[PDB]
Protein backbone atom coordinates (compact mmCIF):
# COMPACT_ATOMS: atom_id res chain seq x y z
CA UNK A 1 0.00 0.00 0.00
CA UNK A 2 0.99 3.65 -0.50
CA UNK A 3 2.66 5.58 2.33
CA UNK A 4 0.53 8.68 2.39
CA UNK A 5 2.63 10.26 5.18
CA UNK A 6 5.54 10.67 2.92
CA UNK A 7 3.19 12.44 0.40
CA UNK A 8 1.77 14.70 3.12
CA UNK A 9 5.23 15.50 4.20
CA UNK A 10 6.40 16.29 0.67
CA UNK A 11 3.23 18.40 0.14
CA UNK A 12 3.81 20.35 3.35
CA UNK A 13 7.49 20.92 2.82
CA UNK A 14 6.88 22.37 -0.64
CA UNK A 15 5.54 25.45 1.12
CA UNK A 16 8.90 26.10 2.64
CA UNK A 17 10.16 26.87 -0.82
CA UNK A 18 8.11 30.16 -0.49
CA UNK A 19 4.44 29.46 -1.31
CA UNK A 20 1.32 30.39 0.63
CA UNK A 21 -0.58 27.22 0.11
CA UNK A 22 -0.94 23.99 -1.71
CA UNK A 23 -3.56 21.46 -2.79
CA UNK A 24 -3.12 18.06 -4.37
CA UNK A 25 -5.21 15.07 -5.28
CA UNK A 26 -4.23 11.59 -6.45
CA UNK A 27 -6.16 8.74 -7.99
CA UNK A 28 -4.79 5.16 -8.25
CA UNK A 29 -6.83 2.12 -9.00
CA UNK A 30 -9.87 4.29 -8.52
CA UNK A 31 -8.64 4.99 -4.93
CA UNK A 32 -8.47 8.80 -4.35
CA UNK A 33 -6.72 10.94 -1.78
CA UNK A 34 -6.78 14.70 -0.98
CA UNK A 35 -4.04 16.98 0.39
CA UNK A 36 -3.97 20.58 1.45
CA UNK A 37 -1.61 22.74 3.44
CA UNK A 38 -0.89 26.34 4.06
CA UNK A 39 -3.25 29.24 3.35
CA UNK A 40 -5.61 30.55 0.59
CA UNK A 41 -5.00 34.12 1.73
CA UNK A 42 -1.83 35.55 3.19
CA UNK A 43 -3.53 38.38 4.99
CA UNK A 44 -6.61 36.63 6.56
CA UNK A 45 -4.87 33.23 6.97
CA UNK A 46 -7.77 31.28 5.74
CA UNK A 47 -6.68 27.71 5.03
CA UNK A 48 -6.02 26.23 1.57
CA UNK A 49 -8.65 23.74 0.65
CA UNK A 50 -8.40 20.71 -1.57
CA UNK A 51 -11.42 21.34 -3.92
CA UNK A 52 -10.42 24.83 -4.95
CA UNK A 53 -10.36 26.08 -8.59
CA UNK A 54 -7.11 27.51 -9.90
CA UNK A 55 -5.55 28.93 -13.13
CA UNK A 56 -3.84 25.91 -14.70
CA UNK A 57 -1.66 27.93 -16.99
CA UNK A 58 0.15 25.74 -19.65
CA UNK A 59 -1.71 22.64 -18.73
CA UNK A 60 -4.12 24.30 -21.18
CA UNK A 61 -1.69 23.08 -23.90
CA UNK A 62 -2.72 19.53 -23.36
CA UNK A 63 -6.44 20.40 -23.95
CA UNK A 64 -5.56 22.35 -27.17
CA UNK A 65 -3.41 19.47 -28.47
CA UNK A 66 -6.11 17.00 -27.75
CA UNK A 67 -8.59 19.01 -29.92
CA UNK A 68 -6.00 19.26 -32.71
CA UNK A 69 -5.50 15.54 -32.54
CA UNK A 70 -9.24 14.78 -32.65
CA UNK A 71 -9.44 16.99 -35.77
CA UNK A 72 -6.61 14.86 -37.30
CA UNK A 73 -8.58 11.74 -36.47
CA UNK A 74 -11.63 13.10 -38.21
CA UNK A 75 -9.51 13.90 -41.34
CA UNK A 76 -9.94 17.65 -40.94
CA UNK A 77 -6.25 18.34 -40.82
CA UNK A 78 -2.94 16.54 -40.96
CA UNK A 79 -0.24 16.85 -38.35
CA UNK A 80 2.34 17.19 -41.03
CA UNK A 81 0.46 19.76 -43.02
CA UNK A 82 2.47 22.93 -43.45
CA UNK A 83 0.74 25.88 -41.77
CA UNK A 84 1.08 27.84 -44.98
CA UNK A 85 -1.86 25.73 -46.33
CA UNK A 86 -4.01 26.80 -43.40
CA UNK A 87 -2.87 30.30 -42.44
CA UNK A 88 -1.06 31.84 -45.40
CA UNK A 89 0.45 35.22 -44.90
CA UNK A 90 0.73 34.93 -41.10
CA UNK A 91 4.06 33.59 -40.15
CA UNK A 92 6.30 35.67 -42.36
CA UNK A 93 8.98 38.41 -42.22
CA UNK A 94 12.26 38.17 -40.32
CA UNK A 95 13.32 35.22 -42.27
CA UNK A 96 10.40 33.05 -41.17
CA UNK A 97 9.51 30.34 -43.62
CA UNK A 98 5.97 29.04 -43.17
CA UNK A 99 6.22 26.46 -45.91
CA UNK A 100 8.57 24.43 -43.68
CA UNK A 101 6.51 24.89 -40.40
CA UNK A 102 4.11 22.10 -39.63
CA UNK A 103 1.20 21.66 -37.24
CA UNK A 104 3.16 18.85 -35.48
CA UNK A 105 6.02 21.21 -34.87
CA UNK A 106 3.85 23.89 -33.27
CA UNK A 107 2.54 21.17 -30.99
CA UNK A 108 6.03 19.91 -29.79
CA UNK A 109 7.74 23.24 -29.85
CA UNK A 110 10.06 22.55 -32.81
CA UNK A 111 8.82 25.24 -35.15
CA UNK A 112 11.29 27.86 -34.08
CA UNK A 113 8.61 30.51 -33.85
CA UNK A 114 9.87 32.98 -31.23
CA UNK A 115 8.22 33.26 -27.80
CA UNK A 116 6.09 36.36 -27.50
CA UNK A 117 6.69 36.79 -23.79
CA UNK A 118 10.34 37.66 -24.63
CA UNK A 119 9.24 40.70 -26.44
CA UNK A 120 10.06 44.07 -24.88
CA UNK A 121 6.48 45.13 -25.57
CA UNK A 122 5.27 42.27 -23.29
CA UNK A 123 4.81 42.87 -19.52
CA UNK A 124 3.98 39.90 -17.26
CA UNK A 125 3.10 42.24 -14.43
CA UNK A 126 0.43 44.02 -16.39
CA UNK A 127 -2.57 42.23 -14.86
CA UNK A 128 -5.18 44.04 -17.02
CA UNK A 129 -4.30 44.02 -20.68
CA UNK A 130 -6.56 42.24 -23.16
CA UNK A 131 -4.78 40.67 -26.07
CA UNK A 132 -6.34 39.28 -29.26
CA UNK A 133 -4.59 36.07 -30.35
CA UNK A 134 -3.30 37.65 -33.59
CA UNK A 135 -1.56 40.31 -31.47
CA UNK A 136 0.40 37.71 -29.61
CA UNK A 137 1.37 36.01 -32.89
CA UNK A 138 2.60 39.29 -34.28
CA UNK A 139 4.55 40.00 -31.11
CA UNK A 140 6.25 36.64 -31.39
CA UNK A 141 7.23 37.03 -35.05
CA UNK A 142 8.53 40.54 -34.38
CA UNK A 143 11.57 38.51 -33.34
CA UNK A 144 13.42 36.23 -35.79
CA UNK A 145 13.21 32.51 -35.75
CA UNK A 146 15.20 30.92 -33.05
CA UNK A 147 16.17 28.20 -35.52
CA UNK A 148 15.00 26.50 -38.73
CA UNK A 149 11.86 24.46 -38.53
CA UNK A 150 12.35 21.10 -37.07
CA UNK A 151 16.11 21.65 -36.26
CA UNK A 152 15.80 22.22 -32.52
CA UNK A 153 13.45 22.55 -29.46
CA UNK A 154 12.43 25.73 -27.67
CA UNK A 155 9.22 26.33 -25.62
CA UNK A 156 6.93 28.61 -27.54
CA UNK A 157 3.61 29.83 -26.30
CA UNK A 158 3.32 31.62 -29.71
CA UNK A 159 2.93 28.28 -31.36
CA UNK A 160 0.02 27.32 -29.14
CA UNK A 161 -1.66 30.67 -29.64
CA UNK A 162 -1.30 29.93 -33.41
CA UNK A 163 -2.83 26.50 -32.91
CA UNK A 164 -5.90 28.10 -31.32
CA UNK A 165 -6.29 30.23 -34.44
CA UNK A 166 -5.80 27.16 -36.63
CA UNK A 167 -8.47 25.24 -34.89
CA UNK A 168 -10.96 27.98 -35.70
CA UNK A 169 -9.73 28.20 -39.31
CA UNK A 170 -10.40 24.45 -39.56
CA UNK A 171 -13.80 24.18 -37.94
CA UNK A 172 -15.25 27.70 -37.87
CA UNK A 173 -15.46 27.45 -34.01
CA UNK A 174 -13.29 29.22 -31.36
CA UNK A 175 -10.74 27.04 -29.61
CA UNK A 176 -12.80 27.48 -26.43
CA UNK A 177 -15.93 26.18 -28.07
CA UNK A 178 -13.98 23.15 -29.30
CA UNK A 179 -12.39 22.46 -25.90
CA UNK A 180 -15.77 22.86 -24.25
CA UNK A 181 -17.72 20.68 -26.69
CA UNK A 182 -15.16 17.89 -27.07
CA UNK A 183 -13.54 17.62 -23.64
CA UNK A 184 -15.23 19.61 -20.81
CA UNK A 185 -18.87 18.74 -21.54
CA UNK A 186 -18.32 15.00 -22.36
CA UNK A 187 -16.11 14.45 -19.32
CA UNK A 188 -18.37 16.57 -17.18
CA UNK A 189 -15.45 18.72 -16.02
CA UNK A 190 -17.96 20.91 -14.07
CA UNK A 191 -15.28 23.08 -12.44
CA UNK A 192 -13.28 23.71 -15.56
CA UNK A 193 -13.61 27.09 -17.35
CA UNK A 194 -12.41 28.98 -20.38
CA UNK A 195 -12.47 32.62 -19.22
CA UNK A 196 -11.41 34.52 -22.33
CA UNK A 197 -10.15 37.92 -21.39
CA UNK A 198 -12.12 38.07 -18.18
CA UNK A 199 -10.01 38.35 -15.07
CA UNK A 200 -12.48 36.56 -12.82
CA UNK A 201 -11.89 33.20 -11.19
CA UNK A 202 -15.56 32.22 -10.66
CA UNK A 203 -17.12 31.78 -7.33
CA UNK A 204 -15.74 31.66 -3.78
CA UNK A 205 -14.17 28.24 -4.30
CA UNK A 206 -10.67 29.38 -5.00
CA UNK A 207 -7.79 30.99 -3.23
CA UNK A 208 -6.07 34.24 -3.74
CA UNK A 209 -3.23 33.99 -6.15
CA UNK A 210 0.10 35.65 -5.77
CA UNK A 211 3.26 36.49 -7.56
CA UNK A 212 6.76 37.04 -6.10
CA UNK A 213 9.52 37.94 -8.56
CA UNK A 214 12.05 38.17 -5.84
CA UNK A 215 12.32 36.33 -2.44
CA UNK A 216 13.27 39.71 -0.84
CA UNK A 217 9.77 41.17 -1.20
CA UNK A 218 6.12 40.69 -0.36
CA UNK A 219 4.17 38.38 -2.68
CA UNK A 220 1.68 40.55 -4.58
CA UNK A 221 -2.01 39.51 -4.84
CA UNK A 222 -2.82 38.99 -8.60
CA UNK A 223 -5.94 36.91 -8.14
CA UNK A 224 -7.58 39.05 -10.83
CA UNK A 225 -5.31 38.67 -13.84
CA UNK A 226 -6.27 38.81 -17.54
CA UNK A 227 -5.61 35.37 -18.98
CA UNK A 228 -5.70 36.51 -22.64
CA UNK A 229 -1.92 36.76 -22.47
CA UNK A 230 -2.08 32.97 -22.37
CA UNK A 231 -5.01 32.14 -24.78
CA UNK A 232 -4.91 28.55 -26.10
CA UNK A 233 -1.39 28.36 -24.56
CA UNK A 234 -2.50 28.92 -20.98
CA UNK A 235 -5.87 30.49 -20.08
CA UNK A 236 -7.82 27.71 -18.47
CA UNK A 237 -9.16 27.34 -14.94
CA UNK A 238 -9.81 23.91 -13.40
CA UNK A 239 -9.64 21.72 -10.17
CA UNK A 240 -7.51 18.77 -9.03
CA UNK A 241 -10.47 16.52 -9.65
CA UNK A 242 -11.21 17.70 -13.15
CA UNK A 243 -7.52 17.50 -14.14
CA UNK A 244 -7.17 13.95 -12.75
CA UNK A 245 -10.21 12.84 -14.72
CA UNK A 246 -8.88 14.55 -17.89
CA UNK A 247 -5.40 12.95 -17.66
CA UNK A 248 -6.87 9.62 -16.73
CA UNK A 249 -9.19 9.58 -19.72
CA UNK A 250 -6.46 10.82 -22.03
CA UNK A 251 -3.83 8.38 -20.92
CA UNK A 252 -6.30 5.52 -20.56
CA UNK A 253 -7.41 5.65 -24.21
CA UNK A 254 -10.78 7.29 -23.75
CA UNK A 255 -10.29 10.67 -25.40
CA UNK A 256 -7.81 10.02 -28.23
CA UNK A 257 -7.86 6.76 -30.11
CA UNK A 258 -4.70 4.68 -30.21
CA UNK A 259 -3.33 6.12 -33.36
CA UNK A 260 -3.60 9.73 -32.15
CA UNK A 261 -2.45 8.94 -28.59
CA UNK A 262 0.66 7.33 -30.09
CA UNK A 263 1.40 10.49 -31.98
CA UNK A 264 0.88 12.55 -28.79
CA UNK A 265 3.35 10.37 -26.96
CA UNK A 266 5.97 10.53 -29.70
CA UNK A 267 8.56 12.82 -28.23
CA UNK A 268 11.53 14.96 -29.18
CA UNK A 269 14.50 15.76 -26.90
CA UNK A 270 14.32 19.04 -25.07
CA UNK A 271 17.76 19.29 -23.62
CA UNK A 272 16.73 20.22 -20.26
CA UNK A 273 16.70 18.66 -16.83
CA UNK A 274 13.66 20.94 -17.03
CA UNK A 275 10.95 19.22 -18.98
CA UNK A 276 12.00 15.78 -20.19
CA UNK A 277 11.14 14.47 -23.61
CA UNK A 278 8.32 16.59 -25.06
CA UNK A 279 5.40 15.15 -27.14
CA UNK A 280 2.29 16.90 -28.56
CA UNK A 281 1.13 19.16 -25.60
CA UNK A 282 2.46 16.69 -23.05
CA UNK A 283 5.84 15.62 -21.68
CA UNK A 284 7.56 12.80 -19.87
CA UNK A 285 8.94 13.20 -16.34
CA UNK A 286 11.19 10.12 -15.73
CA UNK A 287 11.86 9.25 -12.08
CA UNK A 288 15.06 7.46 -10.74
CA UNK A 289 13.01 4.34 -10.20
CA UNK A 290 12.13 4.01 -13.91
CA UNK A 291 8.61 5.46 -13.54
CA UNK A 292 7.43 7.74 -16.36
CA UNK A 293 4.86 10.45 -15.53
CA UNK A 294 3.13 11.95 -18.56
CA UNK A 295 1.51 15.34 -18.11
CA UNK A 296 2.21 19.02 -18.08
CA UNK A 297 2.91 21.93 -15.85
CA UNK A 298 1.74 25.49 -15.72
CA UNK A 299 2.95 28.68 -14.33
CA UNK A 300 0.93 31.87 -14.66
CA UNK A 301 0.83 34.74 -12.31
CA UNK A 302 -0.99 33.60 -9.23
CA UNK A 303 -0.69 29.87 -9.80
CA UNK A 304 1.77 26.97 -10.46
CA UNK A 305 0.40 23.58 -11.37
CA UNK A 306 1.32 20.13 -12.45
CA UNK A 307 -0.97 17.37 -13.52
CA UNK A 308 -0.18 14.08 -15.04
CA UNK A 309 -0.07 10.38 -14.84
CA UNK A 310 1.20 6.96 -15.63
CA UNK A 311 0.61 5.36 -19.06
CA UNK A 312 -2.73 3.60 -19.05
CA UNK A 313 -4.41 6.30 -16.93
CA UNK A 314 -4.71 4.34 -13.69
CA UNK A 315 -2.52 6.47 -11.55
CA UNK A 316 -2.78 10.32 -11.69
CA UNK A 317 -1.91 13.33 -9.62
CA UNK A 318 -2.73 17.03 -9.78
CA UNK A 319 -1.23 19.73 -7.68
CA UNK A 320 -1.42 23.44 -7.39
CA UNK A 321 0.32 26.28 -5.52
CA UNK A 322 -1.16 29.73 -5.20
CA UNK A 323 1.85 31.74 -5.99
CA UNK A 324 4.21 32.18 -8.91
CA UNK A 325 7.63 32.31 -7.17
CA UNK A 326 10.35 32.90 -9.73
CA UNK A 327 13.00 31.54 -7.35
CA UNK A 328 11.36 28.16 -7.17
CA UNK A 329 10.43 27.16 -10.70
CA UNK A 330 10.40 23.42 -10.20
CA UNK A 331 8.67 22.83 -6.98
CA UNK A 332 6.83 19.57 -7.35
CA UNK A 333 9.74 17.17 -7.77
CA UNK A 334 9.51 15.57 -4.26
CA UNK A 335 5.83 15.17 -4.32
CA UNK A 336 6.09 13.13 -7.47
CA UNK A 337 8.95 11.06 -6.03
CA UNK A 338 6.78 10.25 -3.01
CA UNK A 339 3.57 9.53 -4.81
CA UNK A 340 5.00 7.52 -7.73
CA UNK A 341 7.98 5.81 -6.04
CA UNK A 342 8.36 2.86 -5.90
Numbering used by the authors: 17 to 358
Sentences from the paper on this structure:
The crystal structure of the ADP (apo) form was determined at 2.1 Å resolution. The space group is P3221, and one ADP molecule is present in each asymmetric unit. The crystal structure of ADP consists of two subdomains: a five-stranded β-sheet flanked by three α-helices, and a cluster of mixed 310-helices and α-helices. A cavity for binding substrate peptides is also present near the active-site residues. Two regions, the Ω loop and the 283–293 loop (red circle), had higher B-factor values than the average value for the structure overall (32.2 Å2): the values for Ω loop and 283–293 loop are 73.9 and 56.7 Å2, respectively. Therefore, in this study, the ADP structure was compared with DD-peptidase. Three regions, the 132–144 loop, Ω loop, and 283–293 loop, have different conformations in the two proteins. In particular, the structure of the 132–144 loop of ADP is clearly different from that of DD-peptidase: in ADP, this region consists of 13 amino acids and has a loop structure (green), whereas in DD-peptidase it consists of 18 amino acids and contains a helix-turn-helix motif (orange). The catalytic tetrad of ADP is conserved in AmpH-type class C PBPs such as DD-peptidase7 and DAA9, and an oxyanion hole formed by the backbone amide N atoms of Ser74 and Ser315 is also present. Trp233 of DD-peptidase, which creates a small hydrophobic space required for accommodating a part of the side chain of D-Ala (P1) of the substrate (glycyl-L-α-amino-ε-pimelyl-D-Ala-D-Ala [REX]), is replaced by Met245 in ADP; this replacement creates the hydrophobic space required to accommodate a part of the D-Phe (P1) side chain of the ADP substrate. Initially, ADP forms a closed state in which the 132–144 and Ω loops interact.
In this study, we used alkaline D-peptidase from Bacillus cereus DF4-B (ADP), an AmpH-type class C PBP141516, as a model for determining the peptide ligand recognition mechanism of PBPs. ADP acts as a D-stereospecific endopeptidase14 and degrades D-phenylalanine tetrapeptide [(D-Phe)] into dipeptides [(D-Phe)]14. ADP also catalyzes synthesis of peptides: for example, it can synthesize D-Phe oligopeptides from D-phenylalanine methyl ester. Residues from these motifs form a Ser/Tyr/His/Lys catalytic tetrad that dominates the catalysis of AmpH-type class C PBPs. This tetrad is also present in ADP (Ser74/Tyr171/His312/Lys77).
